[PDB]
Every structure is written in C-alpha cells, then in structure tokens.
Amino acid sequence: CSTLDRIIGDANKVASRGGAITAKQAQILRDNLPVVQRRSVFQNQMARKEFVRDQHYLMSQWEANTGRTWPTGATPHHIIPLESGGANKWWNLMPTHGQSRKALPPGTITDLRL
Amino acid sequence: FDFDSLLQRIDSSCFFSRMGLPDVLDSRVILIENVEKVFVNPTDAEFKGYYDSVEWLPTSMTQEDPFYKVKEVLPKELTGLRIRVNKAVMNATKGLSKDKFNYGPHDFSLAARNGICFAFREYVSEQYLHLGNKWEEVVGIYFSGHWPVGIAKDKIVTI
Incomplete structure (x- = not known):
C-alpha cells in the first residue's frame, strides 16, 4: 500500500453514510495531488480562510461530480490535510460525522504514491 | 558592513x-x-x-x-x-545534487534553498540595522558548506 492508499483507506472508515470516497474521486486524488508541499503556519492560516470562503462552492461540486447529495449535517473534511499541502478542491473533501518526530519544515515535498 | x-x-x-x-x-x-x-x-x-x-x-x-x-x-x-x-544566493544554488536532500518519499531541496535565502536576507537586515550576530553565526555555517537546520537553546543543529 502507498501513503495515499492508506490515507484514503483510513478516511473512508470515518466517512458519513452515502459519502464514501469513490473510485473516481480516489483516481483524481492520485492524479492531482500525488506530491504535497508542507505549508508554513501563515500559509495554513491563509488556506483555511480560502476554504471558509469557497466551501459552499466546493460542496456543490462534490455533489455534482459524485452524483450524490451532501450527507445531512456532515462537516467537510480535507482527505490530504491543508497543513500537509492538501488542496481546497471538491475531490479532496469527504463528509464526516463531525507520534515522536517534529513536523517536517515548510517546503518539504513528499511523494504520497510510495 | x-x-x-x-x-x-x-x-x-x-x-x-x-x-x-x-x-x-x-x-x-x-x-x-x-x-x-x-x-x-x-x-x-x-x-x-x-x-x-x-x-x-x-x-x-x-x-x-x-x-x-x-x-x-x-x-x-x-x-x-x-x-x-x-538573487545572489539563488544564482549560487543552481543545480544542487538532489541525493543529499532526498530520503524515501521526502525531498528537502526546496526547504534548503528557501532556508539559505531566508538566512542571507535576515543576515543583511541584521548587519544593516546593527541588531546583533545571531544570523552571522548561521551564515558562517552556510559558508563552511553545511546546512544549519535548527536552533536548540544556544546550539545550531546542522548537516
């Protein structure tokens, strides 16, 4: 299993009913976001603001692209976290019910398909 | 200066x-x-x-x-x-080997190139405004061919 496969597997265990990551969504994730770039604190704060600003558009696109209604009262979860370099894109959202090492320095690039 | x-x-x-x-x-x-x-x-x-x-x-x-x-x-x-x-530090850092900056799925080459440019921009601010010698110490390590990555009390962690 790749890093991406394990993140997708873990995320699906906590997916809202009728909200699972689909085959299509998983392939788009693999294609659009195979390598991620660690964000600074400031870049993470701006990425969160961008999400608050775009999340209604991004939930409509989730509905239109997977052919499903957004599960009732579910919060949108980033599959690849923003802080890790996740995207504010419908294919990086999944609806949800609600150790030792220092974090990598900002600018670190990680290939998820290994 | x-x-x-x-x-x-x-x-x-x-x-x-x-x-x-x-x-x-x-x-x-x-x-x-x-x-x-x-x-x-x-x-x-x-x-x-x-x-x-x-x-x-x-x-x-x-x-x-x-x-x-x-x-x-x-x-x-x-x-x-x-x-x-x-721009000086960007020109002096063209075409670095990636091997020393890579482990497994992790590439540290952009972090290192940003880090050395940060240190030199702040060193110039330090020396221009007479703020001290904290960045002078870090830049000395860069000039010796190493990468100072971390501060831990009065220690500088380096590769």
Whole structure:
C-alpha cells in the first residue's frame, strides 16, 4: 500500500453514510495531488480562510461530480490535510460525522504514491 | 558592513558541498549525518538530548525571524539589498545534487534553498540595522558548506 492508499483507506472508515470516497474521486486524488508541499503556519492560516470562503462552492461540486447529495449535517473534511499541502478542491473533501518526530519544515515535498 | 564583500563571498562559495562531512565548527554546532537522521528517523543520542528543544530555522518566505521580532517598516535601501542578496544566493544554488536532500518519499531541496535565502536576507537586515550576530553565526555555517537546520537553546543543529 502507498501513503495515499492508506490515507484514503483510513478516511473512508470515518466517512458519513452515502459519502464514501469513490473510485473516481480516489483516481483524481492520485492524479492531482500525488506530491504535497508542507505549508508554513501563515500559509495554513491563509488556506483555511480560502476554504471558509469557497466551501459552499466546493460542496456543490462534490455533489455534482459524485452524483450524490451532501450527507445531512456532515462537516467537510480535507482527505490530504491543508497543513500537509492538501488542496481546497471538491475531490479532496469527504463528509464526516463531525507520534515522536517534529513536523517536517515548510517546503518539504513528499511523494504520497510510495 | 561591506555589502559587495558579501556578494563576492557568495559569488565564490560552495553551498551545501560539505553536508555530512565531520568538520570542526563552533562548539555550539550539533552535527547530524544526513536529512534522514534530522527529519525522518531522529535519535536523541545524535541530538545529544536537545531534540525536545529544537526549532527548525525558517524554510519559507512567510515564516517569522526566530531571533529578532522586528515589526518596523524597513528602510527602502534595505528592501533593495534584501532583493539583491536573494538573487545572489539563488544564482549560487543552481543545480544542487538532489541525493543529499532526498530520503524515501521526502525531498528537502526546496526547504534548503528557501532556508539559505531566508538566512542571507535576515543576515543583511541584521548587519544593516546593527541588531546583533545571531544570523552571522548561521551564515558562517552556510559558508563552511553545511546546512544549519535548527536552533536548540544556544546550539545550531546542522548537516
């Protein structure tokens, strides 16, 4: 299993009913976001603001692209976290019910398909 | 402070060329062998107990100066010098080997290139405004061919 496969597997265990990551969504994730770039604190704060600003558009696109209604009262979860370099894109959202090492320095690039 | 002397020093430098060689630096330096042993699989023997205490030096333009929390508007001259030292360090860091910066799925080459440009921009601010010598110490390690990655009390963690 790749890093991406394990993140997708873990995320699906906590997916809202009728909200699972689909085959299509998983392939788009693999294609659009195979390598991620660690964000600074400031870049993470701006990425969160961008999400608050775009999340209604991004939930409509989730509905239109997977052919499903957004599960009732579910919060949108980033599959690849923003802080890790996740995207504010419908294919990086999944609806949800609600150790030792220092974090990598900002600018670190990680290939998820290994 | 001689800015042109700094540009010719940057001009004739060999940045990152001595990464993982066991050279004598300041007694304040903790030398770790490679990116793996700093960032992916650290051990507190190689960190000499200080791992708990370490903060990575800035590796992005959006990060804060750990040494001086200068809120002041910079003189226009200084803005001009910072752009020129940045371009100087960008030209002295073309085509670095990726092998010494890569472990497994992790590529540290952008972090390192951002980090050295950050250190030189802040060094110029430091020397121009007479703020101290914290960045002078970090830049000395760069000039010796190493990568200072981290501050842990009065220690500098380096590859």
